[PDB]
Design a protein that fits this description.
Keywords: Carbohydrate metabolism, Cellulose degradation, Disulfide bond, Glycoprotein, Glycosidase, Hydrolase, Polysaccharide degradation, Pyrrolidone carboxylic acid, Secreted, Signal. It is built from nine helices and eight strands. It has 363 residues and is α/β, with parallel strands linked by helices. Strands 1, 2, 3, 4, 5, 6, 7 and 8 form an eight-stranded parallel beta sheet that branches. The radius of gyration is 19 Å and the shape is globular. Bound molecules: 2-acetamido-2-deoxy-beta-D-glucopyranose (NAG) (2 copies), alpha-D-mannopyranose (7 copies) and cobalt (II) ion (CO). The site of one 2-acetamido-2-deoxy-beta-D-glucopyranose has 5 residues, from loops.
Length: 363
Amino acid sequence: TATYSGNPFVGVTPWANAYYASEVSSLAIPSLTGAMATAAAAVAKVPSFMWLDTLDKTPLMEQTLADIRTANKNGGNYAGQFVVYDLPDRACAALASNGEYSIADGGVAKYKNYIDTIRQIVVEYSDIRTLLVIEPDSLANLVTNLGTPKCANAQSAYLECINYAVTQLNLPNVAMYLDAGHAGWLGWPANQDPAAQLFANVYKNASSPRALRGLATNVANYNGWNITSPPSYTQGNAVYNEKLYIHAIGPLLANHGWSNAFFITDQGRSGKQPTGQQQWGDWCNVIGTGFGIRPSANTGDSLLDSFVWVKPGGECDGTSDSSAPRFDSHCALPDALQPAPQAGAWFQAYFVQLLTNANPSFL
Ligand SMILES: *[C@@H]1O[C@H](CO)[C@@H](O)[C@H](O)[C@H]1NC(C)=O
Ligand SMILES: *[C@@H]1O[C@H](CO)[C@@H](O)[C@H](O)[C@H]1NC(C)=O
Ligand SMILES: *[C@H]1O[C@H](CO)[C@@H](O)[C@H](O)[C@@H]1O
Ligand SMILES: *[C@H]1O[C@H](CO)[C@@H](O)[C@H](O)[C@@H]1O
Ligand SMILES: *[C@H]1O[C@H](CO)[C@@H](O)[C@H](O)[C@@H]1O
Ligand SMILES: *[C@H]1O[C@H](CO)[C@@H](O)[C@H](O)[C@@H]1O
Ligand SMILES: *[C@H]1O[C@H](CO)[C@@H](O)[C@H](O)[C@@H]1O
Ligand SMILES: *[C@H]1O[C@H](CO)[C@@H](O)[C@H](O)[C@@H]1O
Ligand SMILES: *[C@H]1O[C@H](CO)[C@@H](O)[C@H](O)[C@@H]1O
Ligand SMILES: [Co+2]
C-alpha cells in the first residue's frame, strides 16, 4: 500500500521510535537539569533507526509498526526505520562471539528463520513504508578482511544470508540500503572497484530487487558528510568524507551492472569535525563527537536520498571492561570514552558528549 517512486524518503516522515525516546527520557533526562535537560528532550524527537540485533527484538518491530499505523490513521504520514543485523558469525573481524548465531551451529538456517519473521511483519504492515539498512559491517569485511580466518570462513554464509534477506524483503512498501562501510574503509581508491564489484554482484544475484534502492554509509561511524579540510587521521585518502565516497563508488556500481543506486549516510555522531579519533580505524565510543546533520531528504545532492541517524547516539559501541566476554581492545584506547558499558547499553557520559558538541545545536 505504502508504495513509492524515486527517493523513498520523500513524501513521508521518519518515525522517532518509542524505544530510543524511552532511553533518553528515562535514562538520560533524570540526570540532567536546566538547558541540558530541555535540550535532551529535543534529541528524543529526532528519528533514528531501530536495530533488530536479536530475534527477541523482532516483536519490537511489530509494536513500532503498530504505533506508526495508529499515528498514520490520525494524519500521520510516518515511515518505519529498521536495521537488519543478526548474521551468523556477525562482526567476523572480532574474535569473540558478537552475535547470537554462529555458522558452525546451524547459523545460516537460523538467519533465514529470523528473516522469515521480519517478512511476515512487513507483509502484515504493507500499509507502512519501511526503510531498512541491511547488515552493517558484513560485506565491507569481505572486501578487506579476508585475511582474517573468521571472515574468510564466513564469506559463503554472508552472501547466502544477505541474498535471502534482500529477496525476501523485496516488497512494494520497502526500501533497502545495503551497508557499504564508509570513506575510511572502502573509500580508499584501492578498495573502490572491488567493493563496487561485490555490491553490484549482490544486487544482480538477487535479480535486481526493485526494493534495493542503494547503499548505506558511515553506519555507526563518525565521518563528516561534506567536510572541507582533510582531518589528520585521513592522511593518504583523497576520499576523506562521505560525499566524496558515494560519488566515487556510485559510477563504479553502474559500470558493474547496478544503475540507479542511491545512498543514505549516517551523521548521528558526525556533528563535530575533526573527531577525537587518533586513528581512522578507531570506531569505539570515540571522544570529541557530537550529534550531526539532522535526518532530511533535502540533501542538495542527487546521489544522497537522505541524511539519517542509523546508530542511535548514546547507545554504546562496546564495553571497556577488560574482563567482559565481548571486550574489544578498541574500546580501551585513549581516544575512546571510558568507562563504557556493554554494546547497545545506554552510555550516559557519551550521550552528554554528543549533546554538548551537537551541530546543529540542541542547546
Ligand atoms: C548468490 O545467492 C546464493 C543463494 O543461493 C548465494 O549462496 C551466493 O553466495 C550469492 N552470490 C553472490 C555473489 O552474492
Ligand atoms: C554540508 O551539508 C550541510 C547539510 O546540507 C550544509 O548545511 C552545509 O552547508 C554543507 N557544507 C558545505 C561546505 O557545502
Ligand atoms: C505505488 O502505487 C500507489 C497506487 O497504488 C501510488 O499512489 C504510489 O504513488 C506508488 O506508485
Ligand atoms: C511527515 O510528518 C511531518 C510532521 O507532521 C510533516 O511535516 C511531513 O510533511 C510529513 O507529513
Ligand atoms: C523504556 O525503554 C528503554 C529501552 O528498552 C529502557 O531502557 C527504559 O528503561 C524504558 O523501559
Ligand atoms: C521521552 O519522554 C519525555 C517526557 O515526555 C519527552 O520529553 C522526550 O521527548 C521523550 O519522548
Ligand atoms: C522511560 O521508562 C520509564 C520506566 O522505567 C517510564 O516511566 C518513562 O515514561 C519512560 O518510558
Ligand atoms: C544519569 O547520570 C547521572 C550522573 O550524571 C547518574 O548518577 C544517573 O544514575 C544517570 O545515569
Ligand atoms: C529547559 O527548559 C524548559 C522550558 O522550556 C524547562 O522546563 C526545563 O526545566 C529546562 O530549564
Ligand atoms: Co502480530
